[PDB]
PDB file of C-alpha atoms in Angstrom:
ATOM      1  CA  UNK A   1      29.209  22.660  29.369  1.00 33.68           C
ATOM      2  CA  UNK A   2      29.487  19.676  31.710  1.00 31.52           C
ATOM      3  CA  UNK A   3      26.530  17.347  32.063  1.00 33.79           C
ATOM      4  CA  UNK A   4      24.239  17.674  35.078  1.00 34.08           C
ATOM      5  CA  UNK A   5      24.731  15.129  37.867  1.00 34.91           C
ATOM      6  CA  UNK A   6      21.708  13.612  39.611  1.00 35.78           C
ATOM      7  CA  UNK A   7      20.996  12.267  43.107  1.00 39.56           C
ATOM      8  CA  UNK A   8      17.460  11.115  42.414  1.00 39.40           C
ATOM      9  CA  UNK A   9      16.911   9.475  45.809  1.00 38.87           C
ATOM     10  CA  UNK A  10      17.218  13.005  47.222  1.00 38.85           C
ATOM     11  CA  UNK A  11      15.280  14.533  44.251  1.00 40.73           C
ATOM     12  CA  UNK A  12      18.394  16.585  43.552  1.00 40.70           C
ATOM     13  CA  UNK A  13      20.188  17.941  40.485  1.00 43.61           C
ATOM     14  CA  UNK A  14      23.721  19.378  40.419  1.00 41.24           C
ATOM     15  CA  UNK A  15      24.829  21.838  37.732  1.00 42.46           C
ATOM     16  CA  UNK A  16      28.526  22.652  37.363  1.00 43.54           C
ATOM     17  CA  UNK A  17      28.224  25.064  34.398  1.00 44.75           C
ATOM     18  CA  UNK A  18      30.108  28.353  34.500  1.00 47.00           C
ATOM     19  CA  UNK A  19      28.339  31.193  36.314  1.00 45.61           C
ATOM     20  CA  UNK A  20      29.097  34.861  35.626  1.00 46.77           C
ATOM     21  CA  UNK A  21      29.110  37.208  38.605  1.00 48.96           C
ATOM     22  CA  UNK A  22      27.946  40.086  36.382  1.00 52.56           C
ATOM     23  CA  UNK A  23      24.663  38.270  35.638  1.00 53.06           C
ATOM     24  CA  UNK A  24      24.023  37.669  39.345  1.00 54.88           C
ATOM     25  CA  UNK A  25      25.349  40.881  40.921  1.00 55.43           C
ATOM     26  CA  UNK A  26      23.006  42.360  43.506  1.00 53.42           C
ATOM     27  CA  UNK A  27      22.621  45.444  41.274  1.00 52.32           C
ATOM     28  CA  UNK A  28      21.733  43.511  38.096  1.00 51.32           C
ATOM     29  CA  UNK A  29      18.067  44.243  37.384  1.00 47.59           C
ATOM     30  CA  UNK A  30      17.558  40.848  35.710  1.00 46.79           C
ATOM     31  CA  UNK A  31      19.312  38.663  38.285  1.00 43.53           C
ATOM     32  CA  UNK A  32      16.085  36.973  39.388  1.00 46.24           C
ATOM     33  CA  UNK A  33      15.012  36.187  35.821  1.00 48.37           C
ATOM     34  CA  UNK A  34      18.444  34.647  35.341  1.00 46.43           C
ATOM     35  CA  UNK A  35      18.331  32.591  38.555  1.00 50.27           C
ATOM     36  CA  UNK A  36      14.801  31.372  37.852  1.00 50.25           C
ATOM     37  CA  UNK A  37      15.698  30.554  34.245  1.00 48.24           C
ATOM     38  CA  UNK A  38      18.725  28.465  35.288  1.00 51.00           C
ATOM     39  CA  UNK A  39      16.645  26.720  37.951  1.00 50.54           C
ATOM     40  CA  UNK A  40      13.833  26.088  35.459  1.00 49.63           C
ATOM     41  CA  UNK A  41      16.184  24.408  32.970  1.00 50.22           C
ATOM     42  CA  UNK A  42      17.665  22.173  35.691  1.00 50.90           C
ATOM     43  CA  UNK A  43      14.232  21.316  37.112  1.00 52.48           C
ATOM     44  CA  UNK A  44      13.073  20.290  33.628  1.00 53.68           C
ATOM     45  CA  UNK A  45      16.049  17.917  33.374  1.00 55.25           C
ATOM     46  CA  UNK A  46      15.460  16.569  36.893  1.00 54.42           C
ATOM     47  CA  UNK A  47      11.750  15.958  36.189  1.00 56.60           C
ATOM     48  CA  UNK A  48      12.691  14.198  32.943  1.00 58.42           C
ATOM     49  CA  UNK A  49      15.048  11.939  34.928  1.00 60.70           C
ATOM     50  CA  UNK A  50      12.451  11.227  37.628  1.00 61.84           C
ATOM     51  CA  UNK A  51       9.711  10.484  35.083  1.00 64.82           C
ATOM     52  CA  UNK A  52      11.874   7.837  33.376  1.00 64.39           C
ATOM     53  CA  UNK A  53      12.135   5.754  36.571  1.00 63.58           C
ATOM     54  CA  UNK A  54      10.162   2.533  37.118  1.00 61.67           C
ATOM     55  CA  UNK A  55       6.629   3.310  38.265  1.00 65.07           C
ATOM     56  CA  UNK A  56       3.955   1.659  40.430  1.00 69.22           C
ATOM     57  CA  UNK A  57       0.236   2.491  40.683  1.00 72.88           C
ATOM     58  CA  UNK A  58      -1.552   1.897  44.002  1.00 68.20           C
ATOM     59  CA  UNK A  59      -1.992   7.441  42.277  1.00 68.37           C
ATOM     60  CA  UNK A  60       1.389   6.878  40.615  1.00 67.94           C
ATOM     61  CA  UNK A  61       4.717   6.235  42.357  1.00 68.07           C
ATOM     62  CA  UNK A  62       8.326   6.448  41.214  1.00 65.80           C
ATOM     63  CA  UNK A  63      10.848   3.878  42.418  1.00 67.68           C
ATOM     64  CA  UNK A  64      13.636   6.158  43.607  1.00 68.27           C
ATOM     65  CA  UNK A  65      17.182   4.778  43.772  1.00 65.24           C
ATOM     66  CA  UNK A  66      19.034   5.015  47.060  1.00 68.73           C
ATOM     67  CA  UNK A  67      20.430   8.522  47.727  1.00 64.18           C
ATOM     68  CA  UNK A  68      24.100   8.884  46.810  1.00 64.13           C
ATOM     69  CA  UNK A  69      25.244  12.125  48.464  1.00 64.66           C
ATOM     70  CA  UNK A  70      27.339  11.404  51.576  1.00 63.88           C
ATOM     71  CA  UNK A  71      25.432  12.979  54.455  1.00 61.47           C
ATOM     72  CA  UNK A  72      26.314  12.594  58.152  1.00 60.14           C
ATOM     73  CA  UNK A  73      24.071  10.592  60.450  1.00 56.65           C
ATOM     74  CA  UNK A  74      22.567  12.349  63.447  1.00 54.65           C
ATOM     75  CA  UNK A  75      23.330   9.460  65.851  1.00 52.65           C
ATOM     76  CA  UNK A  76      25.958   6.696  65.990  1.00 50.21           C
ATOM     77  CA  UNK A  77      25.144   3.347  64.401  1.00 49.59           C
ATOM     78  CA  UNK A  78      23.514   1.024  67.037  1.00 47.86           C
TER      79      UNK A  78
ATOM     80  CA  UNK B   1      15.011   9.006  70.917  1.00 49.04           C
ATOM     81  CA  UNK B   2      17.423   6.087  70.666  1.00 49.17           C
ATOM     82  CA  UNK B   3      19.783   5.541  67.760  1.00 50.19           C
ATOM     83  CA  UNK B   4      18.419   3.597  64.793  1.00 48.97           C
ATOM     84  CA  UNK B   5      19.850   1.847  61.753  1.00 45.31           C
ATOM     85  CA  UNK B   6      17.373   3.793  59.595  1.00 45.30           C
ATOM     86  CA  UNK B   7      17.336   7.233  61.187  1.00 47.72           C
ATOM     87  CA  UNK B   8      14.316   9.410  61.763  1.00 48.10           C
ATOM     88  CA  UNK B   9      13.936  12.618  59.795  1.00 49.16           C
ATOM     89  CA  UNK B  10      16.322  15.209  61.200  1.00 46.93           C
ATOM     90  CA  UNK B  11      14.495  17.741  63.366  1.00 45.34           C
ATOM     91  CA  UNK B  12      15.460  21.431  63.331  1.00 48.46           C
ATOM     92  CA  UNK B  13      15.387  23.826  66.291  1.00 51.33           C
ATOM     93  CA  UNK B  14      15.293  27.557  65.508  1.00 50.71           C
ATOM     94  CA  UNK B  15      16.817  29.694  68.283  1.00 52.57           C
ATOM     95  CA  UNK B  16      16.387  33.487  68.503  1.00 53.30           C
ATOM     96  CA  UNK B  17      19.575  34.875  69.935  1.00 54.22           C
ATOM     97  CA  UNK B  18      19.856  37.777  72.332  1.00 57.09           C
ATOM     98  CA  UNK B  19      20.392  40.221  69.451  1.00 54.58           C
ATOM     99  CA  UNK B  20      17.688  38.814  67.156  1.00 53.23           C
ATOM    100  CA  UNK B  21      15.645  41.689  65.689  1.00 54.47           C
ATOM    101  CA  UNK B  22      12.231  41.914  64.014  1.00 52.38           C
ATOM    102  CA  UNK B  23      13.538  41.447  60.452  1.00 52.73           C
ATOM    103  CA  UNK B  24      15.549  38.421  61.497  1.00 55.15           C
ATOM    104  CA  UNK B  25      12.575  36.968  63.355  1.00 52.84           C
ATOM    105  CA  UNK B  26      10.390  37.294  60.239  1.00 50.78           C
ATOM    106  CA  UNK B  27      13.075  35.539  58.173  1.00 50.71           C
ATOM    107  CA  UNK B  28      13.306  32.813  60.816  1.00 48.09           C
ATOM    108  CA  UNK B  29       9.540  32.277  60.794  1.00 44.82           C
ATOM    109  CA  UNK B  30       9.378  31.903  56.998  1.00 45.26           C
ATOM    110  CA  UNK B  31      12.453  29.674  56.648  1.00 44.23           C
ATOM    111  CA  UNK B  32      11.408  27.478  59.576  1.00 43.83           C
ATOM    112  CA  UNK B  33       7.950  27.090  57.975  1.00 40.36           C
ATOM    113  CA  UNK B  34       9.611  25.315  55.026  1.00 38.40           C
ATOM    114  CA  UNK B  35      10.958  22.651  57.444  1.00 38.42           C
ATOM    115  CA  UNK B  36       7.507  21.898  58.933  1.00 36.77           C
ATOM    116  CA  UNK B  37       6.475  19.463  60.397  1.00 35.34           C
ATOM    117  CA  UNK B  38      10.041  18.570  61.415  1.00 36.20           C
ATOM    118  CA  UNK B  39      10.667  21.867  63.156  1.00 36.46           C
ATOM    119  CA  UNK B  40      10.641  23.485  66.599  1.00 36.27           C
ATOM    120  CA  UNK B  41      11.289  27.082  67.575  1.00 33.04           C
ATOM    121  CA  UNK B  42      11.827  29.022  70.775  1.00 32.75           C
ATOM    122  CA  UNK B  43       9.565  31.993  71.409  1.00 30.82           C
ATOM    123  CA  UNK B  44      12.062  33.793  73.645  1.00 27.45           C
ATOM    124  CA  UNK B  45      15.696  34.765  73.229  1.00 26.90           C
ATOM    125  CA  UNK B  46      18.767  32.855  74.353  1.00 28.62           C
ATOM    126  CA  UNK B  47      22.209  34.367  74.915  1.00 25.62           C
ATOM    127  CA  UNK B  48      24.324  32.042  72.753  1.00 27.65           C
ATOM    128  CA  UNK B  49      27.821  32.655  71.351  1.00 29.57           C
ATOM    129  CA  UNK B  50      28.443  29.546  69.253  1.00 31.30           C
ATOM    130  CA  UNK B  51      32.136  30.049  68.518  1.00 31.02           C
ATOM    131  CA  UNK B  52      33.086  30.909  72.109  1.00 33.25           C
ATOM    132  CA  UNK B  53      30.883  28.342  73.915  1.00 31.47           C
ATOM    133  CA  UNK B  54      29.048  25.650  71.976  1.00 31.89           C
ATOM    134  CA  UNK B  55      27.820  23.960  75.188  1.00 33.71           C
ATOM    135  CA  UNK B  56      24.245  25.358  75.264  1.00 34.55           C
ATOM    136  CA  UNK B  57      23.719  24.167  71.683  1.00 36.31           C
ATOM    137  CA  UNK B  58      24.716  20.625  72.580  1.00 36.83           C
ATOM    138  CA  UNK B  59      22.307  20.632  75.506  1.00 37.91           C
ATOM    139  CA  UNK B  60      19.475  22.053  73.382  1.00 33.84           C
ATOM    140  CA  UNK B  61      20.123  19.391  70.757  1.00 32.56           C
ATOM    141  CA  UNK B  62      19.769  16.593  73.312  1.00 29.85           C
ATOM    142  CA  UNK B  63      16.904  18.146  75.302  1.00 27.24           C
ATOM    143  CA  UNK B  64      14.784  18.920  72.229  1.00 26.28           C
ATOM    144  CA  UNK B  65      15.990  15.934  70.141  1.00 28.74           C
ATOM    145  CA  UNK B  66      16.981  18.253  67.271  1.00 32.21           C
ATOM    146  CA  UNK B  67      20.164  17.427  65.322  1.00 32.52           C
ATOM    147  CA  UNK B  68      19.792  20.639  63.256  1.00 31.72           C
ATOM    148  CA  UNK B  69      19.854  24.098  64.810  1.00 30.14           C
ATOM    149  CA  UNK B  70      19.762  27.664  63.521  1.00 31.70           C
ATOM    150  CA  UNK B  71      20.760  30.536  65.793  1.00 30.90           C
ATOM    151  CA  UNK B  72      19.622  34.066  64.880  1.00 30.67           C
ATOM    152  CA  UNK B  73      21.872  36.975  65.917  1.00 29.79           C
ATOM    153  CA  UNK B  74      22.576  40.433  64.542  1.00 28.61           C
ATOM    154  CA  UNK B  75      25.332  43.004  65.011  1.00 29.59           C
ATOM    155  CA  UNK B  76      26.761  45.789  62.890  1.00 26.18           C
ATOM    156  CA  UNK B  77      29.694  43.475  62.175  1.00 29.98           C
ATOM    157  CA  UNK B  78      27.480  40.418  61.444  1.00 30.13           C
ATOM    158  CA  UNK B  79      24.018  41.590  60.455  1.00 28.77           C
ATOM    159  CA  UNK B  80      21.116  39.112  60.071  1.00 25.02           C
ATOM    160  CA  UNK B  81      23.438  36.249  61.028  1.00 27.25           C
ATOM    161  CA  UNK B  82      21.987  32.729  60.785  1.00 28.55           C
ATOM    162  CA  UNK B  83      24.368  30.178  62.330  1.00 27.64           C
ATOM    163  CA  UNK B  84      23.502  26.732  60.994  1.00 23.62           C
ATOM    164  CA  UNK B  85      24.577  23.885  63.271  1.00 25.50           C
ATOM    165  CA  UNK B  86      24.482  20.112  62.897  1.00 27.86           C
ATOM    166  CA  UNK B  87      25.126  17.663  65.741  1.00 26.98           C
ATOM    167  CA  UNK B  88      26.219  14.024  65.839  1.00 28.99           C
ATOM    168  CA  UNK B  89      25.341  12.121  68.987  1.00 27.63           C
ATOM    169  CA  UNK B  90      24.263  15.552  70.322  1.00 26.98           C
ATOM    170  CA  UNK B  91      27.821  16.869  69.996  1.00 26.59           C
ATOM    171  CA  UNK B  92      28.672  19.667  67.541  1.00 25.56           C
ATOM    172  CA  UNK B  93      29.405  18.277  64.089  1.00 30.20           C
ATOM    173  CA  UNK B  94      29.722  21.449  62.019  1.00 33.63           C
ATOM    174  CA  UNK B  95      28.641  25.096  62.076  1.00 35.11           C
ATOM    175  CA  UNK B  96      28.580  27.863  59.489  1.00 37.70           C
ATOM    176  CA  UNK B  97      27.510  31.491  59.652  1.00 39.13           C
ATOM    177  CA  UNK B  98      25.261  32.530  56.755  1.00 35.77           C
ATOM    178  CA  UNK B  99      24.348  36.237  56.958  1.00 37.10           C
ATOM    179  CA  UNK B 100      21.211  37.353  55.118  1.00 39.19           C
ATOM    180  CA  UNK B 101      21.755  40.328  52.816  1.00 42.42           C
ATOM    181  CA  UNK B 102      19.458  43.360  52.974  1.00 40.46           C
ATOM    182  CA  UNK B 103      17.716  42.385  49.684  1.00 40.86           C
ATOM    183  CA  UNK B 104      15.795  39.468  51.253  1.00 41.11           C
ATOM    184  CA  UNK B 105      12.141  38.781  50.448  1.00 40.48           C
ATOM    185  CA  UNK B 106       9.577  37.067  52.696  1.00 41.68           C
ATOM    186  CA  UNK B 107       6.624  34.823  51.851  1.00 42.44           C
ATOM    187  CA  UNK B 108       4.378  37.898  52.110  1.00 44.30           C
ATOM    188  CA  UNK B 109       6.333  39.572  49.298  1.00 42.04           C
ATOM    189  CA  UNK B 110       5.029  36.989  46.797  1.00 44.91           C
ATOM    190  CA  UNK B 111       1.487  36.488  45.548  1.00 47.93           C
ATOM    191  CA  UNK B 112      -0.136  33.821  47.744  1.00 45.04           C
ATOM    192  CA  UNK B 113      -0.379  30.362  46.149  1.00 42.99           C
ATOM    193  CA  UNK B 114      -1.545  27.078  47.623  1.00 43.67           C
ATOM    194  CA  UNK B 115       1.277  25.155  49.291  1.00 41.29           C
ATOM    195  CA  UNK B 116       0.890  21.643  50.660  1.00 43.47           C
ATOM    196  CA  UNK B 117       2.853  21.307  53.891  1.00 43.51           C
ATOM    197  CA  UNK B 118       5.210  18.415  54.505  1.00 41.87           C
ATOM    198  CA  UNK B 119       6.057  17.437  50.925  1.00 41.40           C
ATOM    199  CA  UNK B 120       9.563  16.332  50.048  1.00 43.21           C
ATOM    200  CA  UNK B 121      11.358  19.104  48.103  1.00 46.14           C
ATOM    201  CA  UNK B 122      13.331  18.948  44.902  1.00 44.60           C
ATOM    202  CA  UNK B 123      16.797  20.547  44.894  1.00 42.04           C
ATOM    203  CA  UNK B 124      18.871  22.218  42.221  1.00 42.43           C
ATOM    204  CA  UNK B 125      22.426  23.347  43.005  1.00 42.73           C
ATOM    205  CA  UNK B 126      24.075  25.737  40.542  1.00 40.15           C
ATOM    206  CA  UNK B 127      27.822  26.181  40.883  1.00 40.19           C
ATOM    207  CA  UNK B 128      30.856  23.964  40.350  1.00 38.88           C
ATOM    208  CA  UNK B 129      32.323  24.924  43.748  1.00 38.54           C
ATOM    209  CA  UNK B 130      29.503  22.991  45.462  1.00 35.22           C
ATOM    210  CA  UNK B 131      31.404  19.849  44.435  1.00 38.43           C
ATOM    211  CA  UNK B 132      35.033  20.954  44.816  1.00 38.55           C
ATOM    212  CA  UNK B 133      35.404  23.758  47.397  1.00 38.46           C
ATOM    213  CA  UNK B 134      35.430  22.707  51.087  1.00 39.04           C
ATOM    214  CA  UNK B 135      33.221  25.638  52.131  1.00 37.33           C
ATOM    215  CA  UNK B 136      30.584  25.238  49.413  1.00 37.78           C
ATOM    216  CA  UNK B 137      30.648  21.446  49.815  1.00 36.31           C
ATOM    217  CA  UNK B 138      29.659  21.942  53.463  1.00 36.70           C
ATOM    218  CA  UNK B 139      26.855  24.298  52.405  1.00 38.80           C
ATOM    219  CA  UNK B 140      25.481  21.772  49.920  1.00 35.64           C
ATOM    220  CA  UNK B 141      25.721  18.973  52.509  1.00 34.03           C
ATOM    221  CA  UNK B 142      24.000  21.149  55.120  1.00 37.13           C
ATOM    222  CA  UNK B 143      21.064  22.230  52.966  1.00 37.64           C
ATOM    223  CA  UNK B 144      20.383  18.763  51.529  1.00 38.07           C
ATOM    224  CA  UNK B 145      20.581  17.323  55.060  1.00 35.95           C
ATOM    225  CA  UNK B 146      18.426  20.151  56.457  1.00 38.00           C
ATOM    226  CA  UNK B 147      15.487  20.141  54.014  1.00 36.65           C
ATOM    227  CA  UNK B 148      15.321  16.736  52.281  1.00 37.82           C
ATOM    228  CA  UNK B 149      12.878  15.345  54.842  1.00 38.59           C
ATOM    229  CA  UNK B 150      11.790  11.716  54.822  1.00 39.51           C
ATOM    230  CA  UNK B 151      13.769   9.220  52.771  1.00 40.61           C
ATOM    231  CA  UNK B 152      11.405   7.183  50.602  1.00 39.07           C
ATOM    232  CA  UNK B 153      11.619   4.469  47.971  1.00 38.53           C
ATOM    233  CA  UNK B 154       8.251   5.444  46.445  1.00 37.89           C
ATOM    234  CA  UNK B 155       7.770   9.074  45.349  1.00 41.11           C
ATOM    235  CA  UNK B 156       4.283  10.304  44.432  1.00 40.78           C
ATOM    236  CA  UNK B 157       4.441  12.119  41.060  1.00 41.67           C
ATOM    237  CA  UNK B 158       1.668  14.388  42.318  1.00 40.00           C
ATOM    238  CA  UNK B 159       3.797  15.552  45.252  1.00 39.57           C
ATOM    239  CA  UNK B 160       6.538  17.067  43.063  1.00 41.56           C
ATOM    240  CA  UNK B 161       5.434  20.517  44.189  1.00 42.38           C
ATOM    241  CA  UNK B 162       8.418  22.786  44.881  1.00 42.64           C
ATOM    242  CA  UNK B 163      12.159  23.164  44.358  1.00 44.77           C
ATOM    243  CA  UNK B 164      14.836  24.598  46.633  1.00 44.75           C
ATOM    244  CA  UNK B 165      17.411  26.272  44.386  1.00 42.43           C
ATOM    245  CA  UNK B 166      20.891  27.305  45.537  1.00 44.56           C
ATOM    246  CA  UNK B 167      23.221  29.302  43.300  1.00 44.16           C
ATOM    247  CA  UNK B 168      26.743  30.599  43.923  1.00 45.48           C
ATOM    248  CA  UNK B 169      26.909  34.284  42.937  1.00 46.79           C
ATOM    249  CA  UNK B 170      29.371  33.755  40.094  1.00 44.56           C
ATOM    250  CA  UNK B 171      32.507  31.695  39.651  1.00 45.66           C
ATOM    251  CA  UNK B 172      35.579  32.758  41.575  1.00 42.83           C
ATOM    252  CA  UNK B 173      39.301  32.078  41.748  1.00 41.90           C
ATOM    253  CA  UNK B 174      41.152  31.070  44.878  1.00 44.24           C
ATOM    254  CA  UNK B 175      42.310  34.182  46.703  1.00 44.09           C
ATOM    255  CA  UNK B 176      39.143  36.115  45.845  1.00 46.84           C
ATOM    256  CA  UNK B 177      36.337  36.694  48.360  1.00 48.89           C
ATOM    257  CA  UNK B 178      33.929  33.787  48.635  1.00 49.95           C
ATOM    258  CA  UNK B 179      30.751  34.732  46.709  1.00 48.70           C
ATOM    259  CA  UNK B 180      27.340  34.727  48.369  1.00 51.72           C
ATOM    260  CA  UNK B 181      24.974  31.761  48.041  1.00 52.52           C
ATOM    261  CA  UNK B 182      21.542  32.551  46.590  1.00 55.04           C
ATOM    262  CA  UNK B 183      18.660  30.629  48.159  1.00 54.86           C
ATOM    263  CA  UNK B 184      15.338  30.479  46.274  1.00 55.01           C
ATOM    264  CA  UNK B 185      12.095  28.481  46.522  1.00 55.42           C
ATOM    265  CA  UNK B 186       9.828  27.968  43.497  1.00 56.05           C
ATOM    266  CA  UNK B 187       6.556  26.147  42.906  1.00 54.12           C
ATOM    267  CA  UNK B 188       6.199  24.186  39.668  1.00 50.85           C
ATOM    268  CA  UNK B 189       3.645  24.816  36.906  1.00 49.42           C
ATOM    269  CA  UNK B 190       3.319  23.232  33.497  1.00 51.20           C
ATOM    270  CA  UNK B 191       1.717  23.356  30.073  1.00 53.19           C
ATOM    271  CA  UNK B 192       1.547  20.959  27.119  1.00 53.97           C
ATOM    272  CA  UNK B 193       6.601  15.838  28.387  1.00 52.14           C
ATOM    273  CA  UNK B 194       5.149  19.164  29.520  1.00 50.59           C
ATOM    274  CA  UNK B 195       7.310  22.259  29.743  1.00 50.38           C
ATOM    275  CA  UNK B 196       7.907  23.201  33.382  1.00 52.02           C
ATOM    276  CA  UNK B 197       7.509  26.809  34.478  1.00 50.65           C
ATOM    277  CA  UNK B 198       8.447  28.151  37.915  1.00 50.70           C
ATOM    278  CA  UNK B 199       6.868  30.750  40.178  1.00 51.84           C
ATOM    279  CA  UNK B 200       8.814  32.102  43.158  1.00 47.40           C
ATOM    280  CA  UNK B 201       7.141  31.716  46.560  1.00 46.90           C
ATOM    281  CA  UNK B 202       9.953  32.723  48.921  1.00 47.82           C
ATOM    282  CA  UNK B 203      11.697  33.294  51.109  1.00 45.38           C
ATOM    283  CA  UNK B 204      14.391  34.877  48.964  1.00 41.84           C
ATOM    284  CA  UNK B 205      17.716  34.937  50.822  1.00 43.63           C
ATOM    285  CA  UNK B 206      21.238  35.914  49.754  1.00 43.12           C
ATOM    286  CA  UNK B 207      23.704  34.366  52.225  1.00 41.40           C
ATOM    287  CA  UNK B 208      27.091  35.945  52.947  1.00 40.03           C
ATOM    288  CA  UNK B 209      29.454  33.307  54.333  1.00 40.00           C
ATOM    289  CA  UNK B 210      30.936  33.885  57.800  1.00 43.56           C
ATOM    290  CA  UNK B 211      32.961  31.660  60.149  1.00 45.76           C
ATOM    291  CA  UNK B 212      32.979  27.846  60.057  1.00 45.46           C
ATOM    292  CA  UNK B 213      33.507  24.953  62.434  1.00 47.06           C
ATOM    293  CA  UNK B 214      34.236  21.536  60.939  1.00 51.87           C
ATOM    294  CA  UNK B 215      34.392  18.041  62.454  1.00 53.11           C
ATOM    295  CA  UNK B 216      37.548  16.168  63.334  1.00 52.12           C
ATOM    296  CA  UNK B 217      38.472  13.313  60.970  1.00 48.81           C
ATOM    297  CA  UNK B 218      37.470  10.762  63.627  1.00 48.99           C
ATOM    298  CA  UNK B 219      33.955  12.210  63.894  1.00 50.45           C
ATOM    299  CA  UNK B 220      33.589  12.266  60.097  1.00 52.45           C
ATOM    300  CA  UNK B 221      34.365   8.544  59.994  1.00 52.27           C
ATOM    301  CA  UNK B 222      31.880   7.860  62.797  1.00 51.16           C
ATOM    302  CA  UNK B 223      29.120  10.018  61.305  1.00 51.68           C
ATOM    303  CA  UNK B 224      29.456   8.575  57.793  1.00 52.17           C
ATOM    304  CA  UNK B 225      29.787   4.930  58.862  1.00 49.99           C
ATOM    305  CA  UNK B 226      27.604   2.469  56.932  1.00 48.60           C
TER     306      UNK B 226
END
């Protein structure tokens, strides 16, 4: 049961827990309940992370950290 | 649009291919809607074969200023095939075929709920291979890049509306077939921190992984340069 990893600047949560193909098989009648349930648990954790960030009020704003996932630019650096 | 130190939001161009059918067009319309307002689409078909001639994609990317493209084709061999393409300096960066399984669901298959357009999405990725397998790492990079929208330092709590969820269809050992990737979109609800509940809004897509094109090491260095 590894801990979830967060990239809060991208509002993203990463879950490396074991997944069982029998729970998610296209013929499994409860596959969507299982997918939604997993997503719901990870969204709860993500929201809890986001809501513990420093906040401003101008309406309430979170101060997101810089995104950490390495994503390619669309154009070369000037 | 000239290069910038802080880049614009990536724009996506959806391209019906010659063999695009009605089902595929409906999928395209609903998935492209999620990328609004940073989205363009062609109304007519184009005869594109990405793995035999990438040239028309590079021209489209430059002409329409879209560094993200999705081509829609279908054959008996590759049914409901969505080829996702990213460019760097308008040249092909990577491509991957993601073929939509027959169990897909459209927006119309879910009870209509209000949906504010243009909000930044949350993401949850379920599956260890998204961090360690070269194919699933590309898929995670692609979908974050594709849908994350505007980068911001201030996030409005009230705009935390929906989540894009991507799940690998079970763990797998090397040598086994690569499992499908399960794409889901949910809107948040809550009740009293509150307990979050989710309601699916669609589209619901199961992607079967096809062929890939990856960048040379030189291009990687260029594209990821700080």
